[PDB]
Every structure is written in structure tokens, then in C-alpha cells.
Design a protein around this ligand. Structure first.
Ligand SMILES: *[C@@H]1O[C@H](CO)[C@@H](O[C@@H]2O[C@H](CO)[C@@H](O[C@@H]3O[C@H](CO)[C@@H](O)[C@H](O)[C@@H]3O)[C@H](O)[C@H]2NC(C)=O)[C@H](O)[C@H]1NC(C)=O
Ligand SMILES: *C1O[C@H](CO)[C@@H](O[C@@H]2O[C@H](CO)[C@@H](O)[C@H](O)[C@H]2NC(C)=O)[C@H](O)[C@H]1NC(C)=O
Ligand SMILES: *[C@@H]1O[C@H](CO)[C@@H](O[C@@H]2O[C@H](CO)[C@@H](O)[C@H](O)[C@H]2NC(C)=O)[C@H](O)[C@H]1NC(C)=O
Ligand code: NAG
Lengths: 375, 217, 213
């Protein structure tokens, strides 16, 4: 391969960024998969986009990036697929989801379900294999849970579903429904957009929280009825304090484990509420911003005194568990690194500060600026 | 089309057990569109909600009722059913079975007829259907239903076709620890002779159901 | 539980006039609330659910109204055929509770106690006892004390009366008392007499017969 981007330039100090030699996978350093073909992530230049992961066209050029991850499989059913006319999921049949991103049309965990059906040769569903299924993050049609195995306590398997699109409803109005289950917190930590249709949380009855949500906030339409009905009365709920986390924003929660928060009383850490941040006390490294609680660069050096990060990204931070290099605190100092006008530089290694340049070719490890470097 | 007939025991002995059965005319008990429920009403009072049952386990009963009830659902005869055990002096009332609609109204929308059940010691009694031929310009005959327990007695004239201008007085707790009540209908004085009246009386706890034809005095 | 406190117990009003009714729920039932109507002998009839909407169809005059902890039943202009006890009925939080009631009675003119007096029988006394029953269609209003006269003087109390509820189609009443007596004491007198004391007459009317005759 000829060089992608540029090659170690010595002002930026990060193999940047243009041009030199071109690109290809067609076994020909030119440019660039003309009309025909796309381009791999790894600086190739292929055709048909590397199944995992997808295509994309920033700046009219057809790069092809990483799915991150699950990739996106849209599935269908129940009745039709797949699937085809069939009460709830069962039991069979649930297997037809492994790796469903999001799954057009509705979905019923009805209890003719785990019960098993004979009448149609169908073993009870295993609560286990109901975690199929956290691969799901969207629903075109609607959720409809009237069965749910009662030594569960939330809608766990449904913990990554982000969205209940419109798009069809249980009866001609009603997009999410959770009629009379045994659980105790909805457990819908990733659903914050019910596109359209109505929520009805009927007769749950050990069911705390789930009426602290400001529902309208998730509703992308006009007359969005949320009918919270016959449930665990909020004193029953106050008497345990299945109250939202102390640590939780005024906004809400869905369980009580802080992760179950809606937005945070203090700051957040990457999916779950937190006390305060670690920018000052080590542990993942850490440093605040926008109230999220981002870690530091791997190559930073902590401190009782100082803080360890002025921000995200490698360079800007307080010190260095591997030398330094202009701004850029390098993990391992470059050595044999080509090119730029054909040069495999070739830089190291003065103590206290950064790396200094070598003298021609030297694939061997060369010291000072003077001469005595390469025998 | 749909309807919730309450059925079974008139009397129950104390410390013994109430069980009643509801049923389900024009609709398939077994679907998530409905909680099927029970409320009772101590005679002279507000309704008290008991509990209910979805088409899969999930009952929820009234804490009030102190763990005594349970519900359940024979799907054969397409019905569902009460028991209250430990029935007391104060359990005595009228049990309504009724339907809730979740997706409709979230509420009771069809109740059945309502059934009586008196909790109590001894002991059943069919009555006697004495006629009340009148004696004097538009007349009034009647029936006397006496020596009977338990209240409810149900009277009627010409099998529900002498409806109009009829008055069935409330309960009478005569000291005879028995019950009685007086039932009358005002006809045109003229022609007692012609549109005649056997009074279709009945007390269904006991197995009695007799209609004495009120002949003129 | 989560107490409904219907007020005010008892409401007599009179035709085409506005009727105004209300629970205060002990904690907020958001909107989850429905109103009902027990007419004697039958029971309930859901009328409004959620505040607010009338089922299908209850009569448009039926109205309510309310969110939070205080809601209101407004019957708009009352029939006679509005004679019932009316009920609150929450569904927000198990346990479901109803309110206290409100008995709603409708005031009419005043009518006249049209009395009848039918004597005991053989099919009655040929067992062991028998009882002479005196009537009382089809009058108004409430309080209206009886008077009994078995061949002669007094009175008082061992013979018993049973009142209906306000009639469904004119809001009259209807009463009935029973001189009972063993086949020996309603035997050992000749012609027992009825008298009623009625405000819609002058004139405590005596209407009776000899047995018989
Ligand atoms: C468990 O899932 C299975 C599918 O996993 C369901 O069994 C299915 O039952 C359906 C009813 O729609 C069968 O349809 C039939 O199609 C045949 C030809 O295939 C036709 O002769 C009939 O008209 C009939 O309707 C379908 O074959 C079958 N799916 C398969 C292939 O297994 C079942 O309902 C699920 N159990 C429940 C209640 O969840
Ligand atoms: C669902 O996604 C999984 C990934 O977890 C796919 O399974 C395979 O991954 C394992 C090892 O990671 C291998 O056995 C296979 O080579 C993968 N299959 C591929 C990519 O062809 C799995 O096939 C998917 N399941 C279904 C039902 O399609
Ligand atoms: C249905 O849920 C209720 C609540 O989860 C269960 O009853 C509780 O179970 C826990 C288990 O840690 C007990 O310590 C609680 O105290 C129970 N609640 C009370 C006060 O009754 C029940 O387990 C569930 N149904 C089943 C057995 O699956
Ligand atoms: C929940 O029920 C099943 C038993 O089959 C199992 O997944 C798990 O061990 C159970 N026990 C609990 C309450 O954790």
C-alpha cells in the first residue's frame, strides 16, 4: 500500500493528512473506486460494502464505516413474516430475532405464550431466551405485553428499545400497552420517543415509578393519551420509597437504580447517573463537560495537585505516561515511520521532554543531534 | 348481548364460606380486553369493590377484604367465580359481578343483575302466596307473601304483562324471624271478569315458585 | 384505600332545575373517575368516566367535570325519571373505591292517599293466623302517619307498614300496612276500620268494610 492521508508531519505530529500516494484494493495505487465502487475503512477501495459495516456518502464520496454495534437488521412479523398469523411470539419462533436491531410492525408478549400451545405444537417460551430481544431498539407498530414472567420485576428484555414509532396501534388507538403484569418498574431506560399512539399501563399493581415520567416529553403527536390505571398507589410506593433515586433529576426514573434515571440531580456518567465526577480523585481518569463525565486520554498523568485533563482528546492534558511530542503526548515514540518525501522518520528520545529527529534511513534506533547514531 | 348473571347460594352459614359464579352471555371470558370483577353492596350502602381476574392469573383483590377472597375462572362453562371464606355477620350483602374495558372506558360497564346472599345461622324457608281479592272507579287486587326466608322474594302478575300500575312493597322483617311483603296492582273496577290475574310469585332460595290466581271477592 | 367522599348525601330538587353533585377524592385520581346511578332494584349505570365523557348514550343533561382531587356531577335539568342514588368510582389506584352516595329525590305537587282495605282469608286463616291489609296508593309527600280501627278504640303498634321509593314516572310514593292478628282476635271482632291522616285531603278519611259480606 502507498500512504493513506499524509505521513508523520512534524508540526501536527499525527500521520496527517494529505496527500502522497493514492488508494486502492483493486491492486492499483490510484483513485478512487470510480463510480463502480465504495471504500473500506482500512484505506482500501473495494466494491459492495463490507457486510458489517454499512455504506454512507459524506461529501459525495462513498465511504463505508463501522456498524457500532449491533449492525442494523430490520425484522418483521408477527403475522406476517417470518412469522405469519400467530397469536404472541412464542416459544418457537422468538429465535427468528437473534440480532434484530428493530422490528417493523407490532409485537405481542401475550400469555398464550409461555404457557405452551398444544393445539399448535408449541412449547412454553423460556423466560431466558426472552433476552433475544435486547438487540431490539425500535418498533414501527406497537408494544403489547399482557404476559410477563413474574419472577421478573421489569421489562428488562426490552431495555434497549429506544422507540415505539406510530405506526400502528393495539386497537385503532394505543401504541405501547402493559396490561396487568407483576413487575415493579417499567425498566424502559432507552425509550424516550413514542412517535404516536397511546400508553395504557393498566392494572399492574406492584408498579411503582412509571408515573414519574413526563410522558408528553416522549410523545411526538397531538392528542397523546397516557392512561396510568389501577396501579400501585403512590404511598404504597412512598412507604417503600420505590421513590426515584435521590441522585436522580426532578425529571424522572423508571426503576430506582440510578441508571434508571431520566436526567441527573448532579452529573451523569456514560449511561448511568453519578454522585459527582472523578476529574479530581482518579479511577477511570475522568473530567466533566456538558454535565457528562468523560474520561481522560490514556496517556495522561493524574495528580494530587493538578486535574489530569483540560478536555477530551489526547494532547491537551496535564502530563504524560509516555514522553510528549509538541502538543501530542505519544503512547510509543514513532521510530521507523514512513514517509513524506519517502522518509521513514526516525525520531527519539530526550528525557524530561519530547522526541528529537534522526539522520537518514536509520531503521536502527538513533540518539542525539550530533552524529554517533547508526553503527 | 353480553351479560353477567350472578348465580348460586342464597344463604351461607357464618364461619363457613361464600362462593358465587358469574357468566358470560355473548362473549369469550378469555381475552385481554376485560377485567371481570366483583363488587358487593351491603344492603343500605355504598358499593365495595372486591377484586378481579385477567385471562391469565393476575388477580388483584381488595386489601380491605383481608386475604379472604379468591377469584378463578372455569372456562368450560365460560364463567368466573368468587369465594369469600370466613363470612361474618358483616359479610352480608349483594354481590355484583361486572365487566371492565381497559381499552374502552377503563371502567365497569356491564354489570350483571346482582345476587343476594345473607350470611346467617339457621335456616331456609319457602312461604305461602295468599290472594288479595278486593272489596268495594278503578280497582286494586293483590298477593300476600308470608312466612319466608331469605329475602329475596320475586313477584309478578300475569308473567310480566300486568307490569303497569303495580307496587311490590319493600322487605318486612316480621318478628317470626321470617320475612313478608305486600304486592298490589290497580285495574279498571269494571271487568274484574275478563283480564284475570294469577300472581307469578317465587322465592328461589327455598325451591318454591307458585302463582295463586287472585279470584274476586 | 384512597377514599371518595361524595357530597352532599341527599338532594331533593324539582324538574328542569340544575342538580349539582361532587366527590372530593382523598388523593389525586388524576382524571380517572366515573359517575354512576343506582336506581332501586337494578344497579349501577356508568354515566361519565374520566372527569368528563358520557358513555353511549347516557342523556346529554348528564354532565361532569373535574380533575385532581375535586370533580363534579351536574345533572343539567332533572327528570322525575332521574330518581336514583348516584356514585363516584375511581380507577387510578387499586384498591378501587366508590364514594358515599347521593340520594337524589325530585319534588312533585302533593297527591291524595287513595286507600284500599282488603280483609283476611280462609286460604289465610284456615292455617292458623291471617292478616287484614290496608293500602295507600299513590301519593306524595313523605311523612304521613296511619290510623287503625278494629271494630273499636285504638291502636297501637303490632301491624306494620312498608313504603316504596319515589316512583320512577311521576315521583309519587306508595304505602302499605298490615293488621296481623291470630285466627281468634281478627275473628273475635266484626268490622275493622281504616283511617289515614292526609294533608292533601281535609279531613283524616275513614274508608273500610265488614268481614263479610
Ligand atoms: C408459535 O409460532 C408458530 C410459528 O413459529 C405458529 O405456528 C403457526 O401456526 C400458523 C397459524 O397462522 C400456521 O398457519 C397455517 O398455515 C398452513 C400452511 O403453512 C395452512 O394450511 C393453514 O391455513 C394455517 O393457517 C403455520 O404453519 C405455523 N407456523 C409454523 C410454520 O410453525 C404458532 O402460532 C405460534 N404459537 C403461538 C400461539 O404463538
Ligand atoms: C446474529 O448475530 C450473530 C453475531 O452475534 C451472527 O452470528 C455469527 O457470529 C459468530 C461468531 O461471532 C459465527 O458463528 C458466525 O460466522 C456469524 N455469522 C455470520 C456473520 O454470518 C448470527 O448469525 C446472527 N443470527 C442470525 C439468526 O442471523
Ligand atoms: C410478583 O411480585 C411481587 C413483588 O415482587 C412478589 O412479592 C414480593 O417478593 C419479594 C422477593 O424479594 C419479597 O421479599 C417481597 O417482600 C414481596 N412483596 C410483598 C411485600 O409481598 C412476588 O414474588 C411476585 N410473584 C412471583 C412469586 O413471581
Ligand atoms: C426466576 O424464575 C426462574 C425459575 O425457573 C429462574 O430464571 C430464576 O432462577 C428464578 N428465581 C429468581 C427469583 O431469581
Amino acid at each position: 500500500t502507498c500512504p493513506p492521508l499524509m505521513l508523520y508531519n512534524p508540526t501536527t505530529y499525527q500521520m496527517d493528512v494529505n496527500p502522497e500516494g493514492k488508494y486502492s484494493f483493486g491492486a492499483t495505487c490510484v483513485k478512487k473506486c470510480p463510480r463502480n465502487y465504495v471504500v473500506t475503512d482500512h484505506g482500501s477501495c473495494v466494491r459492495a460494502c463490507g457486510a458489517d459495516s454499512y455504506e454512507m456518502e459524506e461529501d459525495g464520496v462513498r465511504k463505508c464505516k463501522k456498524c457500532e454495534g449491533p449492525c442494523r437488521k430490520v425484522c418483521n412479523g408477527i403475522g406476517i413474516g417470518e412469522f405469519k398469523d400467530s397469536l404472541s411470539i412464542n416459544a418457537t419462533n422468538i429465535k427468528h430475532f437473534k440480532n434484530c436491531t428493530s422490528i417493523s410492525g407490532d409485537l405481542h408478549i401475550l400469555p398464550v405464550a409461555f404457557r405452551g400451545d398444544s393445539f399448535t405444537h408449541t412449547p412454553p417460551l423460556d423466560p431466558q431466551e426472552l433476552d433475544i430481544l435486547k438487540t431490539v431498539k425500535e418498533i414501527t407498530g406497537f408494544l403489547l405485553i399482557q404476559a410477563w414472567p413474574e419472577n421478573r420485576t421489569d421489562l428488562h428484555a426490552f431495555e434497549n428499545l429506544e422507540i415505539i414509532r406510530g405506526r400502528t396501534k393495539q386497537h385503532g388507538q394505543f401504541s405501547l400497552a402493559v396490561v396487568s403484569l407483576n413487575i415493579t418498574s417499567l425498566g424502559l431506560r432507552s425509550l424516550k420517543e413514542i412517535s404516536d399512539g397511546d400508553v395504557i399501563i393498566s392494572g399492574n399493581k406492584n408498579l411503582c415509578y412509571a408515573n414519574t415520567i413526563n410522558w408528553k416529553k416522549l410523545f411526538g403527536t397531538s392528542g397523546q393519551k397516557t392512561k396510568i390505571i389501577s396501579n400501585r398507589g403512590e404511598n404504597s410506593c412512598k412507604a417503600t420509597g420505590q421513590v426515584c433515586h435521590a441522585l436522580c433529576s426532578p425529571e424522572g426514573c423508571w426503576g430506582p437504580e440510578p441508571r434508571d434515571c431520566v436526567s441527573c440531580r448532579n452529573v451523569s456518567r456514560g449511561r448511568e447517573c453519578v454522585d459527582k465526577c472523578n476529574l479530581l480523585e482518579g479511577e477511570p481518569r475522568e473530567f466533566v463537560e456538558n454535565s457528562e463525565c468523560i474520561q481522560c486520554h490514556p496517556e495522561c498523568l493524574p495528580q494530587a495537585m493538578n486535574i489530569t485533563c483540560t478536555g477530551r482528546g489526547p494532547d491537551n492534558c496535564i502530563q504524560c505516561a509516555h514522553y510528549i511530542d509538541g502538543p501530542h503526548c505519544v503512547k510509543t515514540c514513532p521510530a521507523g515511520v514512513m514517509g513524506e518525501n519517502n522518509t521513514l522518520v526516525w525520531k527519539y528520545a530526550d528525557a524530561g521532554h519530547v522526541c528529537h529527529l534522526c539522520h537518514p534511513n536509520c531503521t536502527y534506533g538513533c540518539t542525539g543531534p550530533g552524529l554517533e547514531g547508526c553503527p | 348481548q353480553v351479560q353477567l348473571q350472578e348465580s348460586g347460594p342464597g344463604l351461607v352459614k357464618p364461619s363457613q364460606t361464600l362462593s358465587l359464579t358469574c357468566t358470560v352471555s355473548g362473549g369469550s371470558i378469555s381475552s385481554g380486553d376485560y377485567y371481570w370483577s366483583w363488587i358487593r353492596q351491603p344492603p343500605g350502602k355504598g358499593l365495595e369493590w372486591i377484586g378481579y381476574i385477567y385471562y391469565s392469573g393476575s388477580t388483584d383483590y381488595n386489601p380491605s377484604l383481608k386475604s379472604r377472597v379468591t377469584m378463578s375462572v372455569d372456562t368450560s362453562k365460560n364463567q368466573f367465580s368468587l369465594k369469600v371464606n370466613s363470612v361474618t355477620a358483616a359479610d352480608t350483602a349483594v354481590y355484583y359481578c361486572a365487566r371492565v374495558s381497559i381499552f374502552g372506558v377503563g371502567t365497569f360497564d356491564y354489570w350483571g343483575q346482582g345476587t343476594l346472599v345473607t350470611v346467617s345461622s339457621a335456616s331456609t324457608k319457602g312461604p305461602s302466596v295468599f290472594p288479595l281479592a278486593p272489596s268495594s272507579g278503578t280497582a286494586a287486587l293483590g298477593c300476600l307473601v308470608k312466612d319466608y326466608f331469605p329475602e329475596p322474594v320475586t313477584v309478578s302478575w300475569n308473567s310480566g304483562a300486568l307490569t303497569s300500575g303495580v307496587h311490590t312493597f319493600p322487605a318486612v322483617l316480621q318478628s317470626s324471624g321470617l320475612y313478608s311483603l305486600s304486592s298490589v296492582v290497580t285495574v279498571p273496577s269494571s271487568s274484574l271478569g275478563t283480564q284475570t290475574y294469577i300472581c307469578n310469585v317465587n322465592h328461589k332460595p327455598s325451591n318454591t315458585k307458585v302463582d295463586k290466581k287472585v279470584e274476586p271477592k | 384505600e384512597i377514599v371518595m367522599t361524595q357530597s352532599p348525601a341527599t338532594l331533593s330538587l324539582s324538574p328542569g332545575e340544575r342538580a349539582t353533585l361532587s366527590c372530593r377524592a382523598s388523593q389525586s385520581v388524576s382524571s380517572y373517575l366515573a359517575w354512576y346511578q343506582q336506581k332501586p332494584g337494578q344497579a349501577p349505570r356508568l354515566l361519565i368516566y374520566d372527569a368528563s365523557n358520557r358513555a353511549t348514550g347516557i342523556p346529554a343533561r348528564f354532565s361532569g367535570s373535574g380533575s385532581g382531587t375535586d370533580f363534579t356531577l351536574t345533572i343539567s335539568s332533572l327528570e322525575p325519571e332521574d330518581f336514583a342514588v348516584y356514585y363516584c368510582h375511581q380507577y387510578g389506584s387499586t384498591p378501587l373505591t366508590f364514594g358515599g352516595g347521593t340520594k337524589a329525590e325530585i319534588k312533585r305537587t302533593v297527591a291524595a292517599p287513595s286507600v284500599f282495605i282488603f280483609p283476611p282469608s280462609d286460604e289465610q286463616l284456615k292455617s292458623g293466623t291471617a292478616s287484614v291489609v290496608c293500602l295507600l296508593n299513590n301519593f306524595y309527600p313523605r311523612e304521613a302517619k296511619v290510623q287503625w280501627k278494629v271494630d273499636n278504640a285504638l291502636q297501637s303498634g303490632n301491624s306494620q307498614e312498608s313504603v316504596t321509593e319515589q316512583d320512577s314516572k311521576d315521583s309519587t310514593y306508595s304505602l302499605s300496612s298490615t293488621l296481623t292478628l291470630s285466627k281468634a282476635d281478627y275473628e273475635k271482632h266484626k268490622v275493622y276500620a281504616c283511617e289515614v291522616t292526609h294533608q292533601g285531603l281535609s279531613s283524616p278519611v275513614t274508608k273500610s268494610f265488614n268481614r263479610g259480606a
